[PDB]
Amino acid sequence: APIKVGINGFGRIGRMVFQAICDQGLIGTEIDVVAVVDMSTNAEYFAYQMKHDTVHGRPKYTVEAVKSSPSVETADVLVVNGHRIKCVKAQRNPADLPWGKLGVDYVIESTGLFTDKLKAEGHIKGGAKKVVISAPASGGAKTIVMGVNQHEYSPASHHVVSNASCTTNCLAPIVHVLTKENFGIETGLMTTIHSYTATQKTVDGVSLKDWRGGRAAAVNIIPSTTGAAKAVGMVIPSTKGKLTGMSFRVPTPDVSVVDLTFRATRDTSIQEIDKAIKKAAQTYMKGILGFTDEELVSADFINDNRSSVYDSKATLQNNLPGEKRFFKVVSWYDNEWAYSHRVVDLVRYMAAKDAASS
Template sequence: LLKYDTMQGRFTGEVEVVDGGFRVNGKEVKSFNEPDASKLPWNDLNIDVVLECTGFYTDKDKAQAHIEAGAKKVLISAPATGDLKTIVFNTNHQELDGSETVVSGASCTTNSLAPVAKVLNDDFGLVEGLMTTIHAYTGDQNTQDAPHRKGDKRRARAAAENIIPNSTGAAKAIGKVIPEIDGKLDGGAQRVPVATGSLTELTVVLEKQDVTVEQVNEAMKNASNESFGYTEDEIVSSDVVGMT
């Protein structure tokens, strides 16, 4: 699965299994099977940063287990609860001062929404808005009709055959990233039959009057950077796969 990926394509480097893990392009990577993060050998391995991508340690107290195991920092690749910062790169990463031990990198939808909302608020003033994410199906949905592990009757349906209404926490989480617009956005999600490649629609009321499409597009273009792209090409969802 490290070498062959249905969505992202084949990894062209060398991957081989070795004792205690695997080797990628000559560099050994250790592998562990330990359900208790506090028992992982981060101290022995002199680990600086743990990327917490399991989905189980998504609050500060739980993620602290990695610190107890010897890691210096933890970055949670999901929305998180507790007294910790939620950071979207190139939107509010300047808030980090180096003293943080656990930080949330927010959800994929919040990473999509935040840069756009920031530009609109900074340049035109955002009064209120409604966002909808047209989202690829995810691992918490069924691939065929069957009882869902959380009892959700919609996510119980075949993901690749249905448009499935769902909730999203991105509209509320945006307040953790951009406090000035906290409580100004609401929204929902539609899970659609594509395996990867999603979009976020944002409809807003602006403080500034008579704002034109050209002004908004120019503002987005000027704000574009290595993590926030801008294009006028007539692309589709598959065209963004592999860009991040």
């Protein structure tokens, strides 16, 4: 049966998720997008935001704005590839949303305002079965990183899942093969050269939380922080307290790169690792972890759905020749595309386990 879904917050991640749904052909049959929600309800504005994107270009599907009853002035229904989607008005509280009435089982929380498990439980109280937070969730919700611990999902216990962060969906896959392939990680520190996002400012403005983050985004190298720092251990408990890091926000609208440095448990080599990541990429991590033997730059990873695509050359060429412990692993990721495709995956998977149980 079509998985009944709703999108709360039709932003970068909101629209990229919807796009991954329509482009993989899932829309209408496999998955069913009932209603999207944002500040306005002008299906016309939504139609425009969908047809033209600065970084990803025009979507493969076809969208139209139609007003339901001719009495309403502004259009309020998107018609994507023969399928009516409703434009619901934004609520300050999740529990105010007409999910249950609408017939929405899986709510995708991507407004970014409700990262808390409790604040996000409101969707359930609004009539929804499950909720997938598009960011590191607080209040102890279940953090899952596809390709690493999706199996740990519990149809009975877990009703408010978190798909971690973009950096997390990049680092965790790597940390996974590293332990699984027995190279092990004693202590590690990582940095992510990150594209700027919606939360940064075009010009020096206010950001009471992070002082630096409020500076002119596209004009400075802004040291900041990463979700992946915390989130990594909640997926791979083995690394808890043994891994930490930061992020440098730089003047690029999309695509980021993880720069991991770690110490192995056993003596090994960079070729050994390089070989195991490529192998892992072609075997058990296929579709999640990929790699590259080319001299690529950031722009070359735009629209690349792999959670993390390891850089062969970059890594091999920048490690100590005589070394068996202290290593560096470079890996890229398109932070809006890959992550979004991982959210659709989680949904569909959660729906599979939900069909078995509840």
